[PDB]
Amino acid sequence: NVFTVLLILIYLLLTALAAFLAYQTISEVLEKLKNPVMSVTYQEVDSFPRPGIALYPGNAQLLSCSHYYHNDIPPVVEPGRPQEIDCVVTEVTYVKRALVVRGPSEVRSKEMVFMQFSSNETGEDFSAISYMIFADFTDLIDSQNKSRFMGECETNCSRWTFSGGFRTWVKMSLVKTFGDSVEFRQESAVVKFNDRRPAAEQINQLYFAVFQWRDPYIQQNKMIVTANPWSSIAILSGVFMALFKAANFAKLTIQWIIR
Template sequence: MGWKALEGDESADQQKACMNKFSFYLREFYLLSEDVERVSENPTEEREEEMEVNEDSSSVILPDGELGTTTPSLRFSKTCLKNVFSVILLFIYLLLMAVAVFLVYQTISDFREKLKHPVMSVTYKEVSLYDAPGIAFYPGKARLLSCKHHYYDHIPPLINPGQPGDIECTTQRINYTDPFTNQTMKYALVVQGPRDVKKRELVFLQFHLNETDQDFSAIDYLLFSSFQEFVSSPEKAKFMKDCESSYSSWKFSGGFRTWVKMSLVKTKEEDGTETVEFKQETSVVNYIDQRTKPRSDQLFFVVFEWKDPFIQTVQDIITANPWNMIALLCGIFLALFKAADFAKLSVKWMIKIRRRHLKRTRQKLKKHS
């Protein structure tokens, strides 16, 4: 009886052990089947994520836990790098937009500044013959002894200096009131100046002053643009008053030969009028008086010649070109619109990617729950 009871207990224990082994193997098989199903489902989700990312140019950076990976540390994939690069591009375009706005402001400011401050332009016109200028002398007590035209800078030696000689120049004498005081009468001797600049024509004049009560002796003169205008003017006195008011006067001293080289400058004003001005280069040479007897009188020698065959024209020009400004502004505004469009699309795309990610996360949480 004792052996039978012992054998019954051993058989019961064996049956119980077999049942435990069977339940263990069943549980292991169930767990293994779940792992296989999870492994088979994950590649499909990853492929879907890659396809969604490829449709868009970039995406936000997500932790590995949200992407379904088991590693706790963050990992940057190609998609994440594309996302970062897209954000950087967005900021670059915003910076370019700011630069474009600054360029628009600077362009408009420069255009207005150029309109207010025109640039002086100088042009030169070559001529072979000038319009003969008028030379107005104010000799006072001095007397004109000789006046001749010479060519090629050659002046022959003086014959009987201090004595009256040939006057081969066209001259006119005129009296008029001083334009500044309107009381003093002035006497002027107007002489026709040289014309032929190619042949280097010059006018040589000699004056004589017998006596003077001044410490220094000099003769005043002024230049005006056209001797022919003076001759044809019906009111010569008024013409000379206007010339004296408009032009500067110079002097040449006694006991010297003064050589004056003239150049003509024309200035165009904003209202379209044109003014004429003479520039001069003067050289002075001492006269050696070789007369036998000592003299108390003074001799004056002066030469007038054109410096070069170029008439200088000065005018103010506006360098601001409205067409260039319009073209530049069009290009800047086009860049602004393109940058704004790109920024808008980038923001929309980032919002769309974020929504997809949130939707995918909610689906995973719902599935696990």
């Protein structure tokens, strides 16, 4: 009577296959649950809120802050001192002065902030001006104390520079992270400014900069996990249901073979 030994063999092979599938599903779901996957989405926005460009001039002085639309850069009429157009907020924080310039809105009309500095430097030998871009300009002027908020952004918001003698076309764009947080990233483009001034007044450098928006989109980053635990739990129920089914079918076939 070797029929019950063969029935125990096919039941042992069926529970071995069910235990192998139950190990492999839990191992694969834990492996896809360990490493998350970033998912990108481009939300279109027709008009941005006006950001703040917190420039840090050491001894430089702002000479222009004129907005220009539709990529129309005119020739500058003189490298002396004209009057500003945009609203500047000169504030002194300590964690240094931060000449905050209100940035551009209206991305579809291509608005830029052409600005121009000048510095007769004598102590430093690397002509740079740092800056830092935060998300909203009205949050600065609608604050009860500006030196708390600019201090707070001097720890988290990152600082780039531009050079002395070059127009630095800065094209910024937003990135929103979920999981909320909103940060900037820019791409400079250096173009040499040829001096056609007399050589008596060429001791002072000139710092041009163009800040515009790149494209009317906001990149959205969501951290997503590609493992499904509830589905995996169900899949284990469908395995543990067929481990009973195939054992009952083998118990029927083991008696039907000697009928």
